[PDB]
Design an enzyme around this catalytic site. Structure first.
Site, PDB file in Angstrom:
ATOM      1  N   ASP A   1       2.679   1.485  10.167  1.00 20.53           N
ATOM      2  CA  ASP A   1       3.098   0.643  11.285  1.00 20.53           C
ATOM      3  C   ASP A   1       4.447  -0.049  10.997  1.00 20.53           C
ATOM      4  OD1 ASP A   1       3.355  -1.077  13.421  1.00 20.53           O
ATOM      5  OD2 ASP A   1       1.527  -2.232  13.033  1.00 20.53           O
TER       6      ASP A   1
ATOM      7  N   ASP B   1       8.538   0.581  17.046  1.00 22.73           N
ATOM      8  CA  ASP B   1       7.148   0.287  16.648  1.00 22.73           C
ATOM      9  C   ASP B   1       6.238   1.489  16.585  1.00 22.73           C
ATOM     10  OD1 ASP B   1       4.754  -1.045  15.987  1.00 22.73           O
ATOM     11  OD2 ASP B   1       4.270  -1.586  18.066  1.00 22.73           O
TER      12      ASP B   1
HETATM   13  C1  LIG Z   1      -4.797  -1.960  14.148  1.00 18.96           C
HETATM   14  C2  LIG Z   1      -3.459  -2.678  13.920  1.00 18.96           C
HETATM   15  C3  LIG Z   1      -2.440  -2.490  15.060  1.00 18.96           C
HETATM   16  C4  LIG Z   1      -1.040  -2.975  14.623  1.00 18.96           C
HETATM   17  O1  LIG Z   1      -1.137  -4.381  14.373  1.00 18.96           O
HETATM   18  C5  LIG Z   1       0.049  -2.837  15.711  1.00 18.96           C
HETATM   19  N1  LIG Z   1       1.179  -3.695  15.281  1.00 18.96           N
HETATM   20  C6  LIG Z   1       2.411  -3.439  16.050  1.00 18.96           C
HETATM   21  C7  LIG Z   1       3.060  -4.802  16.484  1.00 18.96           C
HETATM   22  C8  LIG Z   1       4.446  -4.706  17.188  1.00 18.96           C
HETATM   23  C9  LIG Z   1       5.157  -6.046  17.280  1.00 18.96           C
HETATM   24  C10 LIG Z   1       4.717  -7.057  18.171  1.00 18.96           C
HETATM   25  C11 LIG Z   1       5.384  -8.307  18.213  1.00 18.96           C
HETATM   26  C12 LIG Z   1       6.467  -8.578  17.345  1.00 18.96           C
HETATM   27  C13 LIG Z   1       6.912  -7.614  16.450  1.00 18.96           C
HETATM   28  C14 LIG Z   1       6.223  -6.389  16.430  1.00 18.96           C
HETATM   29  C15 LIG Z   1       8.071  -7.897  15.482  1.00 18.96           C
HETATM   30  C16 LIG Z   1       7.619  -8.153  14.016  1.00 18.96           C
HETATM   31  C17 LIG Z   1       6.803  -9.423  13.883  1.00 18.96           C
HETATM   32  C18 LIG Z   1       5.892  -9.635  12.676  1.00 18.96           C
HETATM   33  C19 LIG Z   1       4.471  -9.017  12.713  1.00 18.96           C
HETATM   34  C20 LIG Z   1       4.070  -8.084  13.710  1.00 18.96           C
HETATM   35  C21 LIG Z   1       2.773  -7.520  13.704  1.00 18.96           C
HETATM   36  C22 LIG Z   1       1.888  -7.943  12.721  1.00 18.96           C
HETATM   37  C23 LIG Z   1       2.220  -8.846  11.737  1.00 18.96           C
HETATM   38  N2  LIG Z   1       1.298  -9.248  10.755  1.00 18.96           N
HETATM   39  C24 LIG Z   1      -0.186  -9.429  11.161  1.00 18.96           C
HETATM   40  C25 LIG Z   1      -0.446 -10.557  12.168  1.00 18.96           C
HETATM   41  C26 LIG Z   1       0.316 -11.822  11.921  1.00 18.96           C
HETATM   42  S1  LIG Z   1       1.796  -9.518   9.162  1.00 18.96           S
HETATM   43  C27 LIG Z   1       0.573  -9.183   8.244  1.00 18.96           C
HETATM   44  O2  LIG Z   1       2.093 -10.913   8.980  1.00 18.96           O
HETATM   45  O3  LIG Z   1       2.917  -8.692   8.881  1.00 18.96           O
HETATM   46  C28 LIG Z   1       3.515  -9.375  11.748  1.00 18.96           C
HETATM   47  C29 LIG Z   1       2.398  -6.601  14.742  1.00 18.96           C
HETATM   48  O4  LIG Z   1       1.217  -6.633  15.162  1.00 18.96           O
HETATM   49  N3  LIG Z   1       3.273  -5.708  15.340  1.00 18.96           N
HETATM   50  C30 LIG Z   1      -0.484  -3.298  17.045  1.00 18.96           C
HETATM   51  O5  LIG Z   1      -0.630  -4.545  17.196  1.00 18.96           O
HETATM   52  N4  LIG Z   1      -0.799  -2.469  18.073  1.00 18.96           N
HETATM   53  C31 LIG Z   1      -1.358  -2.884  19.353  1.00 18.96           C
HETATM   54  C32 LIG Z   1      -1.625  -1.767  20.421  1.00 18.96           C
HETATM   55  C33 LIG Z   1      -2.017  -0.441  19.864  1.00 18.96           C
HETATM   56  C34 LIG Z   1      -2.757  -2.223  21.338  1.00 18.96           C
END
Ligand SMILES: CCC[C@H](O)[C@H](NC[C@@H]1Cc2cccc(c2)CCCCc2cc(cc(N(CCC)S(C)(=O)=O)c2)C(=O)N1)C(=O)NCC(C)C
Length: 373
Positions: free
Chosen positions: A221, A35
């Site tokens: 990301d 990640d």
């Molecule tokens: C500013 C943005 C930060 C970014 O989101 C960043 N994303 C990384 C995370 C990692 C993660 C968590 C849980 C599960 C997974 C992986 C596997 C893939 C699952 C699908 C998925 C994941 C994310 C996000 C999605 N989507 C959005 C929410 C549903 S999407 C658009 O459907 O692909 C799908 C997501 O947020 N993964 C984040 O959360 N960081 C937080 C810390 C810095 C505090």
């Protein structure tokens, strides 16, 4: 030795990419989500109905308790746990062992996924966004500090169901991409933040103020599935993609990513969906380059018929270039030089008429104005 890391990634579509790791003494094997959107190393450390296995600290003779709690909220999922350190290795990575910070996950909410085959997460971004605070050294920082592994890694994510790819730790494997690498500056070391300076759809400029493209921020990301866009940019992009494909009709829920769309097997009308070009800030004054993605990337296949979910979606926290953008490209996170490189991947999508591409140089005036403040 980079050949040993080729194909060291696996995954399920829409559920992240993971690498095999071991923690503790004797070594405990776990699959760990790769990640670039976070900075904590965390593993299941207690029973959970979606976990096949978990970190057992009492069985590791090298485990050390830090006697401090931690929680991390993600855009999807959250967990809390107990901080500690232990020895860590990557069997299909460099031949080294490091003592790293580990969050042992004791409770979680919509984080672990039913049947995903991974049991933890490897946050590869910078300390500035680590929890509880930036004193908790991220894994890659520890790796570089304790060994001679160079301060860079690259990710080759391949799409389709099961996916695969490569994380090359400490370098660039030239057999994994074609043509030239194009680099964009890391604007700030927290997320892998970049600046998008122009957007075109089928060769037509969206013509928005470029600040809108980075409204809040833009980040790379690998932990996110979709290409995520600020509300205003998302609405312009959808309107344009709708118009290009108006020869067919899709329920409005499709465009929200909620329902599938299906065509008779092998008859998917790729030609009516447009290519999207994202122009990134380059390395020299007034210079940019573009990466071009095909519908084969932003229509994610899901289960007689070929069925897809629209994998461009809305964000209120800036642009997120997720797996659908990374797939088909060789992406170099060159931390040593504060830049991210893109090249056409050896596992590129095949359209008989169009090609995913990384192209430069382009001239773009006033690129600094595109950064949000
Ligand atoms: C500013 C943005 C930060 C970014 O989101 C960043 N994303 C990384 C995370 C990692 C993660 C968590 C849980 C599960 C997974 C992986 C596997 C893939 C699952 C699908 C998925 C994941 C994310 C996000 C999605 N989507 C959005 C929410 C549903 S999407 C658009 O459907 O692909 C799908 C997501 O947020 N993964 C984040 O959360 N960081 C937080 C810390 C810095 C505090």
């Amino acid at each position: 030795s980079f050949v040993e890391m080729v194909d060291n990634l696996r995954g399920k579509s829409g559920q992240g990419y993971y690498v095999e790791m071991t923690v503790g003494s004797p070594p405990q094997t776990l699959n760990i989500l790769v990640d670039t959107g976070s900075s904590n190393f965390a593993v299941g450390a207690a029973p959970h109905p979606f976990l096949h296995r978990y970190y057992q600290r009492q069985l590791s003779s090298t485990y050390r308790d830090l006697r401090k709690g931690v929680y991390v909220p993600y855009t999807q999922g959250k967990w809390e746990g107990e901080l500690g350190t232990d020895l860590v290795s990557i069997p299909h990575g460099p031949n080294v062992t490091v003592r790293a910070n580990i969050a042992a996950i004791t409770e979680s909410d919509k984080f672990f996924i039913n049947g995903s085959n991974w049991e933890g997460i490897l946050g590869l971004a910078y300390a500035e966004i680590a929890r509880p605070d930036d004193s908790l050294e991220p894994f890659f920082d520890s790796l570089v500090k304790q060994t001679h592994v160079p301060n860079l890694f690259s990710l080759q994510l391949c799409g389709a169901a099961s996916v695969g790819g490569s994380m090359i730790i400490g370098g660039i494997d030239h057999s994994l991409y074609t043509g030239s690498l194009w680099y964009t500056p890391i604007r700030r070391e927290w997320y892998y933040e970049v600046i998008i300076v122009r957007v075109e759809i089928n060769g037509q400029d969206l013509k928005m103020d470029c600040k809108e493209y980075n409204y809040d921020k833009s980040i790379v990301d690998s932990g996110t599935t979709n290409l995520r866009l600020p509300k205003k940019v998302f609405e312009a992009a959808v309107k344009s993609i709708k118009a290009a494909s108006s020869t067919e009709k899709f329920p409005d829920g499709f465009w929200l990513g909620e329902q599938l769309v299906c065509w008779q097997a092998g008859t998917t009308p790729w030609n009516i969906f447009p290519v999207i070009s994202l122009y990134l800030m380059g390395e020299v004054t007034n210079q940019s380059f573009r990466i071009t993605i095909l519908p084969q990337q932003y229509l994610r296949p899901v289960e007689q018929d070929d069925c897809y979910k629209f994998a461009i979606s809305q964000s209120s926290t800036g642009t997120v270039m997720g797996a659908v953008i990374m797939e088909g490209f060789y992406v170099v996170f060159d931390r040593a030089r504060k830049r991210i490189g893109f090249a056409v991947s050896a596992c590129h999508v095949h359209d008989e008429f169009r090609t995913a591409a990384v192209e430069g140089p382009f001239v773009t005036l006033d690129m600094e104005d595109c950064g949000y403040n």
